[PDB]
């Protein structure tokens, strides 16, 4: 089997992407944030504290003839941005772009933090990291990809995120028309539960490539590119007037600037992020100070190849017995 679904930016900045997902019988369609940095499929629901729901579409398990309470199971998750959610668990039928999994754990939110409530466009998350990170207790549950894998034509999914435009998540096949050149594959460590790999270096604009190993994670659920402070300083030093602002929380730059590109290495291959992809717009409405799309990871503990980087590539998440990542230009 295979599946194919369109993923759409939630706003004019590409702050995140939503993909329609069918849950239950008859189908209830929710727009979920596919997140290769976490492993829980959770939704706003009829159980979510009413004051914490503000415009989202909810899953109502009592209206699904295939929903079953997973007795005794609870979940609770906290994300790198400080947001969080928790609740109980059902199993139900879940379909993405024509690919169906029966018995998928659907984690129903009883509580969500303010940033989720305040974002009316995201109805929940669909985790695509390794199932060892799933938070369900006392019986850990499998991701949608893990449950579908054995049925797929090939044990892979691909992320093809657009810049200010829709893109695609495919399951079970590699669309050879969606990228240019060849796909370069690189090793993955699953020891932390992430799609963790090592970039071979970077360049700023038309500058020379610096060969240096950069360990990080391929994370569709993080907006920006978070890299070591040395790398980030080298980038922003090429932008007149750019500075790190403790009050704003990162590098800012004059909105009048034209930004240089940023290149990262994948083995001997190179992925070029155009400068425009690094512009996240005014820090506040009407400001002439703009927020940068490359930021320091120094306060995180891990480097994160988020959407800024991934949307410059066609990315293969290869879930073979020994997982690997593939990157192609597009």
Curated annotation (Swiss-Prot):
Disulfide bonds join 255-290. The keyword Repeat does not apply. Its EC number is 3.4.23.22. It comes from the Eukaryota. It is an enzyme of class 3 (hydrolase). The active site is at residues 35, 199. One of its GO terms (molecular function) is aspartic-type endopeptidase activity. Keywords: Aspartyl protease, Disulfide bond, Hydrolase, Protease, Signal, Zymogen. It catalyses: Hydrolysis of proteins with specificity similar to that of pepsin A, prefers hydrophobic residues at P1 and P1', but does not cleave 14-Ala-|-Leu-15 in the B chain of insulin or Z-Glu-Tyr. Clots milk. The keyword Coiled coil does not apply. Residues 17-328 form the Peptidase A1 domain. GO terms for biological process: proteolysis. Belongs to the peptidase A1 family. This is Endothiapepsin. The chain holds residues 90 to 419 of 419 of the full protein.
